[PDB]
Design an enzyme around this catalytic site. Sequence first.
Site, PDB file in Angstrom:
ATOM      1  N   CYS A 105       0.860  -1.271   0.000  1.00 59.28           N
ATOM      2  CA  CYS A 105       0.000   0.000   0.000  1.00 59.28           C
ATOM      3  C   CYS A 105       0.870   1.285   0.000  1.00 59.28           C
ATOM      4  O   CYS A 105       1.438   1.387  -1.013  1.00 59.28           O
ATOM      5  CB  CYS A 105      -1.053   0.084   1.040  1.00 59.28           C
ATOM      6  SG  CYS A 105      -2.286   1.290   1.096  1.00 59.28           S
ATOM      7  N   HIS A 125      -0.295   1.319  -3.381  1.00 59.07           N
ATOM      8  CA  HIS A 125      -1.621   1.955  -3.513  1.00 59.07           C
ATOM      9  C   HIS A 125      -1.561   2.978  -4.641  1.00 59.07           C
ATOM     10  O   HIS A 125      -0.530   3.671  -4.778  1.00 59.07           O
ATOM     11  CB  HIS A 125      -1.971   2.683  -2.206  1.00 59.07           C
ATOM     12  CG  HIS A 125      -3.406   3.098  -2.180  1.00 59.07           C
ATOM     13  ND1 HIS A 125      -3.867   4.253  -2.752  1.00 59.07           N
ATOM     14  CD2 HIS A 125      -4.456   2.428  -1.642  1.00 59.07           C
ATOM     15  CE1 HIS A 125      -5.165   4.262  -2.550  1.00 59.07           C
ATOM     16  NE2 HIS A 125      -5.588   3.192  -1.901  1.00 59.07           N
TER      17      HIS A 125
END
Lengths: 187, 187
Positions: A105, A125
């Site tokens: 992420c 992400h």
Amino acid sequence: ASKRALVILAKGAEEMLTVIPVDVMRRAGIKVTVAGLAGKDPVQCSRDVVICPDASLEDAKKEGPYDVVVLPGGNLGAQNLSESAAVKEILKEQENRKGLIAAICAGPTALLAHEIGFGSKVTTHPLAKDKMMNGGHYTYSENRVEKDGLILTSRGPGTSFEFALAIVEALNGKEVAAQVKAPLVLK
Amino acid sequence: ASKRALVILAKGAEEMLTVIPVDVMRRAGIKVTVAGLAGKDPVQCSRDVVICPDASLEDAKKEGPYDVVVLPGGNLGAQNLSESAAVKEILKEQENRKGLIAAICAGPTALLAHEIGFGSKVTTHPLAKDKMMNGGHYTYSENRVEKDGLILTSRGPGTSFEFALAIVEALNGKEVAAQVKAPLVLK
């Protein structure tokens, strides 16, 4: 002999991105140490879940090496990982010994900070792409999980089961990963 | 006025089934209280993640009522929920005031124990079906999330984002749920 994982837990870490990999790796029979960056004390995660680490990072480091070092995401957690000289040392040593590093992420941005794995294909992400790509040191991927040799990355809460099972597959093989996956009720 | 959620956290709860709903509900702007069944002390979850509750259940109860009461799964956690007179009282009062109750994985078996929601359609983890269905007091579903009015149930770790977003939709509406969902990187 079981495989061992080090999960580095800093203030502001994304608690889903911490707990899903810890839990799934333990389901796979991996010996996981949740290590607090700042010490032994409880850690306040990004959405205010408070997790008590198994050990301080200082102590966990002495009990290595580990088959995987896992970096959760959460922007503030990733920043704390990125600012830590202790994390720099652990990641460099893991890279030097040809051990797996897994980050999810904003977590992979700590690899950038510590100059780990340059030349690899990575994902993050979507909102962390520009940070990760500063300097063009990595090649970006939109795959939900990306593994370029010993650098394993993934995108977000919704890819965290896939991420964790990719770690399991890397350490314990495809059959163990499949056995751990079935009771999870994945789609 | 924001909506409020009570998440009841017992020893042996499934930590993914606890953290995913807490985090996603907080992303939705719901005021979530993580309440420890046994008191204020840290809780050892099923895969040994240790979570510090926000409050004891005794104290949290005094600050109600809540728009949703959430029961995580984990067999031993669900058993502890099922054996608690305090949980019985909270769930009966929630049912009596026509408030939402949400339970995931073995979590719904605590509804059986406390005679909550009989006549509803429910789902559980596949391995919890037989327990939930003892007596035929519910109608079983294999949907990943089941909502029969004010009883909302789901199946396992892999359905926990869907479960949490169903709670968000019930409390805050479809648009908020969609906005919270997008940054999660669901498939």
